[PDB]
Write an enzyme that holds these catalytic residues in place. Structure first.
Site, PDB file in Angstrom:
ATOM      1  N   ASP A 212       0.857  -1.188   0.000  1.00 27.36           N
ATOM      2  CA  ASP A 212       0.000   0.000   0.000  1.00 27.36           C
ATOM      3  C   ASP A 212       0.885   1.227   0.000  1.00 27.36           C
ATOM      4  OD1 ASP A 212       0.271   0.933   3.099  1.00 27.36           O
ATOM      5  OD2 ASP A 212       0.181  -1.245   2.967  1.00 27.36           O
ATOM      6  N   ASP A 214       0.461   3.562   2.376  1.00 25.26           N
ATOM      7  CA  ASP A 214       0.106   4.125   3.684  1.00 25.26           C
ATOM      8  C   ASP A 214      -1.057   5.118   3.488  1.00 25.26           C
ATOM      9  OD1 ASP A 214       0.534   3.992   6.496  1.00 25.26           O
ATOM     10  OD2 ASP A 214       1.724   5.836   6.417  1.00 25.26           O
TER      11      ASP A 214
END
Ligand SMILES: Nc1ncnc2c(CN3C[C@H](CSc4ccc(Cl)cc4)[C@@H](O)C3)c[nH]c12
Ligand SMILES: Nc1ncnc2c(CN3C[C@H](CSc4ccc(Cl)cc4)[C@@H](O)C3)c[nH]c12
Ligand SMILES: Nc1ncnc2c(CN3C[C@H](CSc4ccc(Cl)cc4)[C@@H](O)C3)c[nH]c12
Lengths: 273, 273, 273
Positions: A212, A214
């Site tokens: 990801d 974040d």
């Protein structure tokens, strides 16, 4: 002889990697490891697998017994520890699915014992101040980097991991601040795992997989448990192939000097009364 | 139906805000809350007041049972938690007496459990990783901001709160560093209160009141207990009016979707064995 | 009358500094101090020496009982505490062997009680919020700076100490980040020693001695236990001479006002029920 401990992270802790598997529960002076050690081989190489969070993922990062995990692998006779870790990306060019062969960390943990030498254990007596200028084995990292290239994998040759306490993910202000500090990726488990390995005189290297961005970027899927799980479902095979291909390379190269130097650095960091 | 928990901070925890008051001491699986819950109403709205530090201010920030406080308000049936917090200002334009409707935090706490899901409680089973990109309820914050404007109060529409462990105030080097990080205000209680509220599926918003300029500025009164108490004596009526005016507005708007989305985010952050 | 507690740091904790030595083991409500207090004099001045890590260096920074150490020195009747501390240098111009008369800190510790007022001790009742804008006694620091000049010692008139949890040394990413924050020197013991001294109404000053360049610089000897020990073997005599020359100066100047002001700041930081 080398023997490779493998600590499996989130979605990256599959026992099926080893042939000739035998399950062995152990005890250490620091308590029980996360789960049974799994003894096995990759080609001719003796390995020992351990699920960082338990095989059912039941243990959150703050409660993982890093001391018992590292101690257990050492007692088993491991010369190297190669781990997997999922992580958030703090850098546009580190895309979900990319592997990062991290070379530095920044500690943001708060609740974790970072040493075996706490003055409470007979097996680890004295005061120990381990140097952390070069936290990861450069020789192991070299082999991981060269192997990932041979595999055609998207891979970054260095990176600074910020390790947060968790279990919450970071706020946006925190995510942005970690970027200003020069962190490249973010997780909850590198520290103190890397510290304890160094105190044990073990070659430690980490395979980080970005899952990801974040929460700093724009127009990306937000970090969540579901999002992390999804990226690992899709990309975990990469970390498996990299381990399977790297490990036989480690077993065919000479480590006596590297390991002697590690053992010395570890021994000379301890002051006895 | 909405029900609003109100957690009163330093100098900002007056029970006289509620009509039809009934005192109720409760227990939770995480221990006792800071003090008795006070059940009452503002206009037609059911509210539940709790003094963060006890009604005599006997509990320092490190020892406040944030888990028990949030759990108690949830069990009481609260849909929203609006808190007050005193704070130091890290920004020239945020003057003592100003209200800041904070939207972000930076955690500098070290000793606090930040999750209900610690693997020790039956009521909260599993591993929970709550997303923190948007820590505060934007809808509640909107209403606070619009209300403060209707009241003619000096108020800031956003701000990053750095929460320090305490109980000491910051050094000057620390105060200056928090400014470089982009923190706007400083306190000792936002984290993990905001984290636990999110895990509970509760709309949480904070009314921060600036009481000092910490120690970074020049030619300002130094932060001290006396200085903080003095600013609150003078300005606490503002936070009271803002709560009293905001709360009936919350009770007259529709929350089913907002709360459904929060409950989902919370539920999907938990992994079961 | 003044009485000077001296807390000896790594390699800088020699009892031979005092004449007329008497060993006295004490107890406090916070437990036992690091070791026996050593009662003695420098010229006409009553002093009390205490080895921060024990006289055999058996206690690592995380486990040092800072509360018991400060409490013991207070109970003994100390008006001042002057300590020694080894440290890494974060600044090219601060060379190994240089003394730094530090005036600020940045806290990176995580596991340490920073207050006597924890709600568990009868001797320290209430909630205490000590101001930390000026953590070190400026009058004591002045005398140290002037004395080091009279001695011809390489000495810096100010500096910000970052105190890390330890016992590991910092990574390179951390070392570089501490430089961006404006830290000048690095250790593991300043916090919370300086905080507790302030709560006790005691004039506290620190003699920091640089022993290494941590791990940030190029072409310097890497920080390690052996390297720190080597620099102290060579330079410890400087800290000894500075103490021996400074202390009689403190005893001949007037402290009633300075100490009155400290006692007030301390008393007014405590809120009683
Ligand atoms: N943005 C981010 N921030 C911090 N850590 C992470 C991590 C690393 N870990 C994943 C894991 C949370 S997601 C997850 C998924 C499936 C299951 Cl079964 C269990 C957990 C934590 O241990 C941190 C990935 N992204 C991160
Ligand atoms: N410069 C600053 N830094 C950190 N926190 C604060 C705070 C917030 N809290 C106030 C409070 C210290 S002052 C105070 C006054 C009266 C009474 Cl009865 C009790 C305490 C702590 O909980 C932190 C205000 N200014 C701050
Ligand atoms: N680069 C650095 N980083 C953090 N702290 C230090 C310190 C300060 N302390 C020295 C000490 C480690 S070296 C040492 C030497 C002999 C003996 Cl008997 C015991 C320990 C720790 O308490 C931190 C010096 N250099 C530092």
């Amino acid at each position: 002889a080398v023997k490779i401990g493998i600590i499996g992270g989130t979605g990256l802790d599959d026992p099926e990697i080893l042939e000739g598997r035998t399950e062995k529960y152990v005890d250490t002076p620091f308590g029980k490891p996360s789960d049974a050690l799994i003894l096995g081989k990759i080609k001719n190489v003796d390995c020992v697998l351990l699920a960082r969070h338990g095989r059912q993922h039941t243990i959150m990062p703050s409660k993982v017994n890093y001391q018992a995990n590292i101690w257990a692998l050492k007692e088993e006779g491991c010369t190297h520890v190669i781990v997997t870790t999922a992580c958030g990306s703090l850098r546009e060019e580190i895309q979900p699915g990319d592997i990062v062969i991290i070379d530095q960390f920044i500690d943001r943990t708060t609740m974790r014992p970072q040493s075996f030498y706490d003055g409470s254990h007979s097996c680890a007596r004295g005061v120990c101040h381990i140097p952390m200028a070069e936290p990861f084995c450069p020789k192991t990292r070299e082999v991981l980097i060269e192997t990932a290239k041979k595999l055609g994998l998207r891979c970054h040759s260095k990176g600074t991991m910020v390790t947060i306490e968790g279990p919450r993910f970071s706020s946006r202000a925190e995510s942005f601040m970690f970027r200003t500090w020069g962190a490249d990726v973010i997780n909850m488990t590198t520290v103190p795992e890397v510290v304890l390995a160094k105190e044990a005189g073990i070659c430690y290297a980490s395979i980080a997989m970005a899952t990801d961005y974040d929460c700093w970027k724009e127009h990306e899927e937000a970090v969540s448990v579901d999002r992390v799980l999804k990226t690992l479902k899709e990309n975990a095979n990469k970390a498996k192939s990299l381990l399977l291909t790297t490990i036989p390379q480690i077993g065919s190269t000479e480590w006596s000097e590297t390991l002697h130097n590690l053992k010395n650095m570890a021994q000379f960091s301890v002051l006895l009364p």
